[PDB]
Coordinates of C-alpha atoms in Angstrom, one line a residue:
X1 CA 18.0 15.7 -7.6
X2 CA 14.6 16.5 -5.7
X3 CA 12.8 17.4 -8.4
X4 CA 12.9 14.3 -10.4
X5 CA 12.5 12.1 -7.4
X6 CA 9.5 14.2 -6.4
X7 CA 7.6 13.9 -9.7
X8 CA 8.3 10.3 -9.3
X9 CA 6.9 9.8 -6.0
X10 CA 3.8 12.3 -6.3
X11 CA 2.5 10.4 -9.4
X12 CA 3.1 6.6 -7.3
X13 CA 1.3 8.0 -4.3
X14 CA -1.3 6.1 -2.5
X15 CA -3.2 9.3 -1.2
X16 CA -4.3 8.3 2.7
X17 CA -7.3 9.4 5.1
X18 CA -7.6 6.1 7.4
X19 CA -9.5 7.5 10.7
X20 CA -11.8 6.7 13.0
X21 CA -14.0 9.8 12.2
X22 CA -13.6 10.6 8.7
X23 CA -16.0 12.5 6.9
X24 CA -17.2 12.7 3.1
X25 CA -16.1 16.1 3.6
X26 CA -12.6 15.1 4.4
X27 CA -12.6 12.4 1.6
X28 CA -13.8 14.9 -1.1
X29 CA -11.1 17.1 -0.5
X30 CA -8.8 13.9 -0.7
X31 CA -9.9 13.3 -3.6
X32 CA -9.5 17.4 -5.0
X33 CA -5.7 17.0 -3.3
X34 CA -4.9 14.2 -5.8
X35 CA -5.1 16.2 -8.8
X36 CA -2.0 18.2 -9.0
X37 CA -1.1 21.0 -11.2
X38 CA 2.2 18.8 -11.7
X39 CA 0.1 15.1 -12.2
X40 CA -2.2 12.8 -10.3
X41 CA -1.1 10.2 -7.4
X42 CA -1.5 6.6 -8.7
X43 CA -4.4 6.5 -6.1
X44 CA -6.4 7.8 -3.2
X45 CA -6.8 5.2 0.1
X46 CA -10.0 5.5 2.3
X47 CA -12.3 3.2 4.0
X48 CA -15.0 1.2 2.1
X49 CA -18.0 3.2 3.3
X50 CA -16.1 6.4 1.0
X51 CA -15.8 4.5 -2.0
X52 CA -19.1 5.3 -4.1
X53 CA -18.3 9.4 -2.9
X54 CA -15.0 9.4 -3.6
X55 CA -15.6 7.4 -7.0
X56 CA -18.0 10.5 -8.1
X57 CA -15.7 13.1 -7.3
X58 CA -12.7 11.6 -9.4
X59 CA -15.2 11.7 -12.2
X60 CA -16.6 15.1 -11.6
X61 CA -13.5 16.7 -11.5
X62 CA -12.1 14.9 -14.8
X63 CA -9.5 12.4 -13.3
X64 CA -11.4 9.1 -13.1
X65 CA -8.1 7.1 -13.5
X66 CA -7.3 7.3 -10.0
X67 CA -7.2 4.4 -8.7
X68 CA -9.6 4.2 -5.1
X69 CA -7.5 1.4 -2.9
X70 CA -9.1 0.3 0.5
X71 CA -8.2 -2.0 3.3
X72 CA -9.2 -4.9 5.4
X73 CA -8.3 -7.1 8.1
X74 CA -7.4 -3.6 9.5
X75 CA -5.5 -2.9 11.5
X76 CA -5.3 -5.6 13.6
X77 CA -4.2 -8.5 11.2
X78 CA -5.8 -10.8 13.0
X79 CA -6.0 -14.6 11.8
X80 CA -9.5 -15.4 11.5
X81 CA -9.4 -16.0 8.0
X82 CA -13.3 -15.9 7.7
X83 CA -13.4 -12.4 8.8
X84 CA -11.1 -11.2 6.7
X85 CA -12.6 -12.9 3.8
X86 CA -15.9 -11.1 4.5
X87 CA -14.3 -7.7 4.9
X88 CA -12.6 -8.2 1.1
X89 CA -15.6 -9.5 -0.3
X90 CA -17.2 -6.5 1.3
X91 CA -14.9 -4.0 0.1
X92 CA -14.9 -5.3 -3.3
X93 CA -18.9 -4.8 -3.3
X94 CA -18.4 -1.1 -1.8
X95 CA -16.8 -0.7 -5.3
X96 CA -12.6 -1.0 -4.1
X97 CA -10.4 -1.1 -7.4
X98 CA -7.2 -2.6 -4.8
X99 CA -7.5 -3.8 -1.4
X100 CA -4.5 -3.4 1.1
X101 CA -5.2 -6.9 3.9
X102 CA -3.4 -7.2 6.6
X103 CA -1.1 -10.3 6.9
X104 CA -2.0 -12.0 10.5
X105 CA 1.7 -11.2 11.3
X106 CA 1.1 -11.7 15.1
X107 CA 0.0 -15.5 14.1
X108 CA 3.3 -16.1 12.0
X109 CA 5.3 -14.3 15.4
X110 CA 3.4 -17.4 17.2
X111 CA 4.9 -20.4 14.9
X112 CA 2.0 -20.4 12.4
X113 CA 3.1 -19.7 9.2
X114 CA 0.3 -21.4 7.0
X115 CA -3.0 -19.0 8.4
X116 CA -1.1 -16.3 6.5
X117 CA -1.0 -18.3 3.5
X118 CA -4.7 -19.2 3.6
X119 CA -6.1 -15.8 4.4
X120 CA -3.9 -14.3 1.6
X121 CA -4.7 -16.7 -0.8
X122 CA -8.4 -16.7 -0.3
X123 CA -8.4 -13.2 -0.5
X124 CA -6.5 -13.3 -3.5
X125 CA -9.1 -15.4 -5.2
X126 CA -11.9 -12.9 -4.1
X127 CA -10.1 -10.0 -5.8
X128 CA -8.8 -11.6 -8.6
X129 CA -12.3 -12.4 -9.6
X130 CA -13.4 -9.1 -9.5
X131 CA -9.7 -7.6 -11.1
X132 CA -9.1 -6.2 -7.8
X133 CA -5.2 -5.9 -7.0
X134 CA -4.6 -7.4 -3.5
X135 CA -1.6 -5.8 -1.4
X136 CA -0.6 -7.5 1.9
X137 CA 0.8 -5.5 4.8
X138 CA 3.0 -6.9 7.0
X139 CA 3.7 -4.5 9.5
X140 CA 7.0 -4.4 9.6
X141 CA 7.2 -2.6 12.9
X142 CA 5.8 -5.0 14.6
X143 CA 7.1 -7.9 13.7
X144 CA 11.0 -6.5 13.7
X145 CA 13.2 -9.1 13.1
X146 CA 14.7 -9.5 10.0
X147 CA 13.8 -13.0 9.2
X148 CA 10.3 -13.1 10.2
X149 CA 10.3 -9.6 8.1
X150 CA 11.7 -11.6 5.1
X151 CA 9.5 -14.9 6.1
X152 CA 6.0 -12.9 5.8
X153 CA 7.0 -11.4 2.3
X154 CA 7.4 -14.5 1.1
X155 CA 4.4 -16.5 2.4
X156 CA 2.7 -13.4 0.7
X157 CA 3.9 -13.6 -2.3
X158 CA 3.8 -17.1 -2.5
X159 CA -0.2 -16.8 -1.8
X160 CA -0.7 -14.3 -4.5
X161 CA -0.1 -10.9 -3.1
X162 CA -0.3 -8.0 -6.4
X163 CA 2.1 -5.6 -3.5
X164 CA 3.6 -6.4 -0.3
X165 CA 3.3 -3.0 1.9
X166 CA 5.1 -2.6 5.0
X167 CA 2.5 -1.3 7.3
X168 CA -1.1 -0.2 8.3
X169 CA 0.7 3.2 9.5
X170 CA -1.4 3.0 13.0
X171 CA 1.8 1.2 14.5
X172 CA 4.5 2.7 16.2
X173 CA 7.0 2.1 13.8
X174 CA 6.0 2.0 10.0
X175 CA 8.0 2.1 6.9
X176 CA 12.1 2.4 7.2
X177 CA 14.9 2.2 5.1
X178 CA 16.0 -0.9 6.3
X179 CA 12.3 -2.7 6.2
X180 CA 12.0 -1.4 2.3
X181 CA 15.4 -3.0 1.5
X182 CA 14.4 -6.6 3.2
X183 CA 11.4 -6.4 1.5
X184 CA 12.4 -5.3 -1.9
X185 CA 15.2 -8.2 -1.3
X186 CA 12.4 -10.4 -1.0
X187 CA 11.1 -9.3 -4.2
X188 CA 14.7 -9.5 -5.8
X189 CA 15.2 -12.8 -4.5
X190 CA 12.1 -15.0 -5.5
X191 CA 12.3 -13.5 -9.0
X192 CA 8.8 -11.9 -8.6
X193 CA 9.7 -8.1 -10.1
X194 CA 7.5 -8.2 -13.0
X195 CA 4.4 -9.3 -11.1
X196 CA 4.7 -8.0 -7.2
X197 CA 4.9 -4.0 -6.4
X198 CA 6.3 -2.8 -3.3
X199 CA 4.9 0.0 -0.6
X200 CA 6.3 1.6 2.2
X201 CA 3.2 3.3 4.1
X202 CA 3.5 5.5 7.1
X203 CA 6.3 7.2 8.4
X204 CA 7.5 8.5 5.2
X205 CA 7.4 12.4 5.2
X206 CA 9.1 14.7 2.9
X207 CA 10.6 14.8 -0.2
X208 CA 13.9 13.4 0.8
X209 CA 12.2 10.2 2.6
X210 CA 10.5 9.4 -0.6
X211 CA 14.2 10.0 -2.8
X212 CA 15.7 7.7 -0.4
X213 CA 13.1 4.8 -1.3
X214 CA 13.4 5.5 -4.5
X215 CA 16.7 5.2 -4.6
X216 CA 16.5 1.8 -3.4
X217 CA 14.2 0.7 -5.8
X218 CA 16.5 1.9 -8.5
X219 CA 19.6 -0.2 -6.7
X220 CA 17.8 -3.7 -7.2
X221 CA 15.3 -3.4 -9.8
X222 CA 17.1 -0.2 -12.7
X223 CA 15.6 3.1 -12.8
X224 CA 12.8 1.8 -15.0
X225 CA 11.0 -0.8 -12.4
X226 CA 8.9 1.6 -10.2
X227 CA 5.7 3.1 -11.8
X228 CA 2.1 2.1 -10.6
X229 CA 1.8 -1.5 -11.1
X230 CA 4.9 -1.8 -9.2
X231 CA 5.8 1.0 -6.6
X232 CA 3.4 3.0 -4.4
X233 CA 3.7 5.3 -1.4
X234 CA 1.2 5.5 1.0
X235 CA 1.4 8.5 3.1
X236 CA -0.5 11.9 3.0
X237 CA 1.5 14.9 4.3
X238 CA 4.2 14.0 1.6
X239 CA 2.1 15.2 -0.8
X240 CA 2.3 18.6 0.5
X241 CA 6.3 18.4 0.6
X242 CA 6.7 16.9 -2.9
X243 CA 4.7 20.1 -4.1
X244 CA 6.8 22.3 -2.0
X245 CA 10.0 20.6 -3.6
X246 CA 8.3 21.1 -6.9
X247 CA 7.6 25.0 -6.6
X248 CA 4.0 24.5 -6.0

């Protein structure tokens, strides 16, 4: 059973170095990690400043279909919407093929649920422009209930969010079971499977976290929804125990 699942989730992977003091050191071997003797993740996820390094090394070392993915509004989702703007538009200039925003989940905790809409949406237009994909992060573990869990999906989806993604992983609770099920409900409810992917970031581990996801995706949406334009992981010590669960 862990086989499969494994190849599955290796190949959807949205290979992560988010720190405060990366290096183009530590990006470059990002980059060398993604290509597998058993495939290549979908992507690799760094800050903008790595982009143009990280976008060479793919090349040089054959695998230039690796998608690079960035983020913004980050981590903070705050809900100046003008600010977040400017860090898309900035990203997408650094050379981003997706960019992961952070919904300004602590505005819709406060009663406000149109700022999400309109910082969404307007970075939706940016990227669309540029045929970026947009993914929206909710941050799940922060906002905890249930119905403001299902409420954010929504508003992003109904601004124009390519992914919804349940968290920055710089929280201190990230992706669950339970959070991927509401969400992917969310996704199962408005009817939007074709066009909106889903992501559970941080917290997810080993080879047997990434089966159980899976396996939820398979529940709602039949064994032949997840693949790249729908389904990514973002995590970075799984890779290592997909591998292991692999032979490798």
């Amino acid at each position: 059973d862990l086989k499969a699942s494994s190849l599955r989730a290796l190949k959807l992977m949205d290979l992560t170095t988010l720190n405060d003091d990366d290096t183009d050191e530590k990006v470059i071997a990002l980059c060398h990690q993604a290509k597998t003797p058993v495939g290549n993740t979908a992507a690799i996820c760094i800050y903008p400043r790595f982009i143009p390094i990280a976008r060479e090394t793919l090349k040089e070392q054959g695998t230039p279909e690796i998608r690079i993915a960035t983020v913004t509004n980050f981590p903070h989702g705050n809900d100046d919407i003008d600010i977040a703007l400017a860090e898309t538009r900035a990203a997408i200039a650094w050379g981003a093929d997706e960019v992961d925003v952070v919904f300004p989940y602590r505005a819709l905790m406060a009663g406000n649920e149109q700022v999400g809409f309109d910082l969404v949406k307007a970075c939706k237009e940016a990227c669309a422009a540029a045929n970026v994909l947009l993914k929206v992060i909710i941050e799940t573990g922060e906002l905890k209930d249930e119905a403001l869990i299902r409420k954010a999906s929504e508003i992003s989806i109904k601004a124009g969010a390519d992914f919804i993604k349940t968290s920055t992983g710089k929280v201190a609770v990230n992706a669950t079971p339970e959070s991927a099920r509401i969400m992917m409900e969310v996704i199962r409810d408005m009817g939007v499977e074709k066009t909106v992917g889903f992501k559970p970031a941080g917290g997810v581990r080993t080879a047997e976290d990434a089966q159980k996801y899976l396996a939820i995706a398979d529940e709602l949406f039949g064994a032949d929804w997840a693949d790249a334009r729908h389904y990514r992981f973002g995590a970075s010590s799984l890779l290592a125990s997909l591998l292991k669960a692999l032979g490798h």
